Each structure stands twice: as structure tokens, then as C-alpha cells.
Design a protein around this ligand. Structure first.
Ligand SMILES: O=c1ccn([C@H]2C[C@H](O)[C@@H](COP(=O)(O)NP(=O)(O)OP(=O)(O)O)O2)c(=O)[nH]1
Ligand SMILES: O=c1ccn([C@H]2C[C@H](O)[C@@H](COP(=O)(O)NP(=O)(O)OP(=O)(O)O)O2)c(=O)[nH]1
Ligand SMILES: O=c1ccn([C@H]2C[C@H](O)[C@@H](COP(=O)(O)NP(=O)(O)OP(=O)(O)O)O2)c(=O)[nH]1
Ligand SMILES: [Mg+2]
Ligand SMILES: [Mg+2]
Ligand SMILES: [Mg+2]
Ligand SMILES: [Mg+2]
Lengths: 167, 167, 167
């Protein structure tokens, strides 16, 4: 049949993607690892989840408005090709500045201070993404993949070359 | 009928979205508030506009090439679910560095200095987004929302696990 | 016929976009110029390539997971309107911090040090994008462009106003 997406859990640490509502457009993706990201630090957070997006579609592995509005964790949107059967990685950076100051509080993905019994010194603006937290979503859209034809001029001429804030 | 989108203006400060051309793919969104963003400062700029995206679609509340190329104002693309009837917020950050230096000129969304009769000291790289300025656009695309089926291996095996700059 | 996209090479420095696989969702875009980007520096890298996206579609000129995961080069996704026949520009920023330190090594788009016989002093975190390197991709998706109808309340009431990390 159609209207079905294959998903493969690559470890015990993985979790099956879930739609929040029937109305909602994507599936929440869970982190399969606990990671501390210092200011300006980049990482590819593993999900231990693979999918088989069929042809004529592309998967947008993208941020959640809750995480992106509350924290300086920035997720560059991954375009999951209709073929990539590997481990989905979340391309992330802590875009907080490295101002050289210290603190004893990490911050969670809701920007709340993490209280812990054992005291540790962290760089200010550091985040902990915990195993099993919702940090991304996958929205699947159809694509158009025609063959390209080189030309010296186009088929028809109103917008033209105007762009980059021309109105 | 179909081919119609409901829009609700939540205040006098709101404005109806507009297509720039017939050719263009999205609707320009207007700020309903005047906001100053210092370097590294994050905000959710209200539009006082709500919409009812019908099911099988998602709305991409996204940047304009003019604003994003000229300024360090970065808009994280919001995915407006086919259901969210609330106030559309523009998830924004001033990604200019906080170098500790001062100036008397704010900068507008075209990166032009704002001249004002009364002198004030601002942090360098600060922006003023004025009420009624075009700061974002909404592009609506169809989505594919199938039911997920867990598997141990996929239906067919060429790309495979290769990614993250493998070619 | 349909299922064809017109492309126009605006100079000798341009190159025709290419699909990596048959499975893949987009066309790799090549830089038509050699550019050095210092920390925090913004640019619009020219491709010397134009396209005619037909109506009912939009082109996402977007990052590659290889470049974005390995370097601090951030590409803001351009929405190419179904009409824009101009030179496609890659809206890019070097999001590496300006920590005031120096080095003799530029970095390429794989984050590898560039060894050169003549010694030069660069700012730390500077990148060289060379003419003919793959720095972006174009994914084309269909759009929905209805006429807007203003209302005081919506046609039907479960999600409602809930958002920005409400679950
Ligand atoms: O965030 C991401 C982005 C991409 N990917 C995977 C999916 C995609 O099929 C694959 C390659 O994506 P891109 O074509 O955008 N990156 P690049 O062109 O550099 O790699 P390749 O040379 O393999 O195409 O990497 C992720 O798992 N997470
Ligand atoms: O920039 C934005 C992003 C999202 N939104 C709204 C639209 C969407 O329906 C809602 C939730 O979007 P996400 O699912 O991407 N964020 P999150 O998953 O954190 O919130 P929720 O738990 O409500 O799904 O927030 C905005 O108004 N502006
Ligand atoms: O990265 C980009 C982004 C946009 N563009 C072009 C394509 C698009 O048709 C045109 C305008 O895009 P936007 O509507 O998103 N920018 P803006 O609304 O500021 O400019 P205009 O006033 O011309 O619509 O600029 C690029 O070439 N590269
Ligand atoms: Mg959600
Ligand atoms: Mg526009
Ligand atoms: Mg920054
Ligand atoms: Mg590719």
C-alpha cells in the first residue's frame, strides 16, 4: 500500500517518532544521547532512527518553535533525501556567545536552570540535551524533480531580475 | 469553496498579508509592534494576525532575502500547523556580536542609520523593527502525513547510509 | 512539454546544476567566485545561474549538511519565486566568533586547513569558498497560493492558540 512510512530503530536508545495532534504537520524526533553543548559548540546529535522516504518527497528535519525561541540552540534544517536509510542526525549549534564567564548551572532545552547536588563549573550559556527529549521534528513535503534544459533566454519575460528587497 | 485562506486580525495594530506579485510564492507579514533588538537579543515579534491553514498543508513563516542579507536579524522558520489559530509570532534573534562598543545610531531593517533629533546611546549593532514594516513572509506547501510502520529492514536497498558530505 | 526547468548560465564562471543521485531531492549549486569570509562577515555569493521556476512552485536555495555541519558557514534559505529570472545569490554568513586571534591557515568548506607556499596572516575562523565548489542545493516544492478572506472567527474550533512548546 501507499500512505505508510518505514522507520527503523537502530538501538535501544532510539524512540519512535510521534505526531502531537491529528492536525499537526510533522513527527517529533527524540535525542538518543545526552549531550552538553558549550557556547559556539557544534554537533550532530544522533537519533538512532532511520527512515525510507519514498521518491517524489523530501523530509525537512527541522527545529521546534519552543526550543528555538527559548534557547540559543539553532538547528540547521536537514533535507532528508528519498533514499537516505542512515541514522538521522540533528545538525545543531549553541549560538550563545562565549563571553568567558562561568556558572554552576547548565540550562535545559526550556532554558530552565538544572539543579544538581554535586557542584560543577560550566561555561555560561551551556546547554544539556538529555536522552529522550524532543528536540526536532520531521515534516515531509512533495518535490518537483524535472530534467534541466540550458537556454540563452527564457520562454517568457514582470519580476525579472528584481530581488533582495526590491520592493 | 476551496482555494481560500481564513485570516483574523487580532488588533488595530495588525495588517492583512499581501502577495507582492501574482508570480510570487508567499504573503508578506507585517510587524504589529515597534521593537529594539540589541546584539544577541531574542524575541517573538507579534503580528496580531491569526490564520487557519487547512489539513494536508503547513505554513512556512520565513525570512525575506532583503532583511536577512542586509542585517544580522535571523528569523528561524516557523512551521505553522494546520490547526494553530493563535497569534503568529516571528521567532527572531539579532545575531550581531556584542563587542561592548556604543553608538548614537540604531539601524533599520535595510541596515540604514536612523537619524533622530534627541540623542541616545545604543549598543553597536542594535536594530529597530518599526510597527508596520515587512519583516517576514508566509509560504504554504502541501505535506505528506502517513502512518508509521516500524521495521527491522527496509523494502529495498544506492544511497544507503551515505550522507553529511559523502560526495 | 512539462517536467522541464529552464536554466541560463550568465557567464563562463557558471556551472550547470546537477542531481547527485536519481533518488536525491535537489540540484547542487556551484559558486561562480572565489571568496574569503572573515568571522561575522556576510555576503551574497553569486552563482551566475538563473532559472525560471514555473507558477505553483517555489525553489528552496538551501544549505548542504556537509558544509553546515563541518563549518560555521550558515546559509539562510532563499525562497526563489516562480518568476525571478535573475542571478541566484547564496545568502551566507561566517558565524564563527571574532575572538581577535590570528593564524596563517584559512579553512576550506570541509573545515580542512589550506596549505599555501606564500605565508599570509588571517583572522582565526576565516573561510575560503573557491570558484566551482558545491556550497548549496536547490529543492523545488509545490505551493498553495489561495486568496485571503478576512474573518472575525474561524470556520471550526483542538490545537487553537496553543504553541511555542505547549506540550
Ligand atoms: O540534518 C541532517 C541533514 C542531512 N542528513 C542526511 C540526509 C541526506 O540524505 C544526507 C545528505 O544531505 P545533503 O545532500 O543536504 N548534504 P551533502 O550534499 O553535503 O552530502 P551528500 O554529498 O551525501 O549529498 O544527509 C541528516 O541525517 N541530517
Ligand atoms: O515562528 C513560529 C513558529 C511556530 N509558531 C506556532 C505555529 C505552530 O502550530 C506552533 C507549534 O510549532 P512547533 O510544533 O514547531 N513548536 P513546539 O513542537 O515546540 O510546540 P508544540 O508543543 O505546541 O507543538 O507554534 C508560530 O506562531 N511562529
Ligand atoms: O538567497 C536568495 C534569496 C532570494 N533570492 C531572490 C529570489 C526571490 O525571487 C527574490 C526575492 O525573495 P524574497 O521575497 O524572499 N526577498 P524580499 O521580499 O525582501 O525582496 P522583494 O521585495 O523583491 O520580494 O530574491 C535569491 O536569489 N537568493
Ligand atoms: Mg510539535
Ligand atoms: Mg517578497
Ligand atoms: Mg552568533
Ligand atoms: Mg547533495
Amino acid at each position: 500500500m501507499t500512505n505508510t512510512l518505514q522507520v527503523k530503530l537502530l538501538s535501544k536508545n532510539a524512540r519512535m517518532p510521534e505526531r502531537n495532534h491529528k492536525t499537526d504537520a510533522g513527527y517529533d524526533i527524540f535525542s538518543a544521547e545526552t549531550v552538553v553543548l558549550e557556547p559556539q559548540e557544534k554537533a550532530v546529535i544522533k537519533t538512532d532512527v532511520a527512515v525510507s522516504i519514498p521518491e517524489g518527497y523530501v523530509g525537512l528535519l527541522t527545529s521546534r518553535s519552543g526550543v528555538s525561541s527559548k534557547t540559543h540552540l539553532v538547528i540547521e534544517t536537514g533535507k532528508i533525501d528519498a533514499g537516505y536509510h542512515g541514522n538521522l542526525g540533528i545538525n545543531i549549534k549553541n549560538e550563545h556567545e562565549d563571553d568567558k564567564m562561568q556558572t554552576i548551572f547548565l540550562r535545559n532545552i526550556d532554558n530552565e536552570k538544572i539543579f544538581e547536588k554535586e557542584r560543577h563549573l560550566y561555561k555560561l550559556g551551556s546547554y544539556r540535551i538529555e536522552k529522550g527529549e524532543r528536540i526536532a521534528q520531521l515534516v515531509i513535503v512533495p518535490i518537483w524533480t524535472p530534467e534541466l534544459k540550458q537556454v540563452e533566454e527564457f520562454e517568457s519575460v514582470e519580476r525579472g531580475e528584481k530581488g533582495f528587497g526590491s520592493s
